[PDB]
Amino acid sequence: KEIEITVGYHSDDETIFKGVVIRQNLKIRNNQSILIVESRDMAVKMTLRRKSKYFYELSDSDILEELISNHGLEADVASTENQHTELVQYDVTDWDFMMLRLQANGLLCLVDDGKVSIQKPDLSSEALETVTFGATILEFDAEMDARNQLPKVVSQAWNMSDQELLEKEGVDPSLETNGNISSSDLASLFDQEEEVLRHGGSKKDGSLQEWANAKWTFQQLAKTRGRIKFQGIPTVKPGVNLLLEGVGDRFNGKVFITGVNHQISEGNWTVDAQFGLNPEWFSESESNIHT
């Protein structure tokens, strides 16, 4: 069955979630008896069956749109410059295949109310609101870690036409983040040698250049990470910016939101906002991708 959840103050409600019911659980204890109901968005359709397919003269964004439309989902996907002549999907789900291909190009996936949106990070937009330590914050957690910064990144592959290696250096995007310590001050602290991304086969230049660039961008977005808890509103969603104040020069500034948790119970509505990215890739941290 289809479910929709709305919430607000004094009957000024707004929609928070849309999806489909999947599970039903019962629990009985000495003086307690409850029912728990779980639901997910429609995107869940893409995680159920392993497939095999040959693709032909398509860009990665043409492939991403195809994978999504196959399940009747709405899509909005940023374009790419490269075009493959053949690409093979083998014994994997559509969701997993999509994630691997999307990271390789520096893109983030945002799923919301039945629509799948694939875009580059946007650190330029206006903050929605200001959250302040001495006035509005209920809870706060933050971390800085120098081992995540790199001095430079280069990628390699074999050039069969020339009989030598193909090397490409990335480009430093100089992302604008919070705090007052440069990623370039942290990068030089322990080891000034370059990071090398290696592949043993034959690659196109366009692919190698994007790979090195995606790696570097994702590490800068992992520079400062944390959680902010405050009184709930219906507008904070992954992919927005907030202004953080009163927590010291090391952390103050504009922060990019990567996750949201809404909790409604016992008289109040609160929201946990998450900022910063985890530097790990899908292919490194997730289990059971392969048979």
């Binding site: 095999s52 397919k53 691997l100 592949h199 086969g201 890739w281 292919s283």
Partner: protein, 145 residues
Amino acid sequence: PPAAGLTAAISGLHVGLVTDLEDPDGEDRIKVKIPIINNEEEGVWCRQAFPDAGNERGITFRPEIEDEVIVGFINEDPNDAVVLGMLHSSANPNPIEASNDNHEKGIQTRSGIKMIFNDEKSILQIETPTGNLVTLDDDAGSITI
């Protein structure tokens, strides 16, 4: 992670079929279908290994369209496939009958041109389909043209 973490990896060796011998970008590749992935479409371009190869030299034989081949993968990436050799089966019989004595060895082409080495009798025979032959026979002590 497998195949550099950029794609699903493919482990072990696999069997494929040849669909096209003319490489549009000049790298001497051949197009091969892999039935455990998809047995209906055209397939992908693979590199071929030879027993001897170099700059304008080597031993060259290529598979015919619809021949069965064994395929490996560089760094377990599905699009870095290499053809390692050709296979026989009951659908495509071996022209020289098997025996534990292993007396007969040689080359036989599509048109019927043969070159056969008989160890038991120390005989080398070269012969075309319509009777032109040269034979070196130690069991006769003779040479015939």
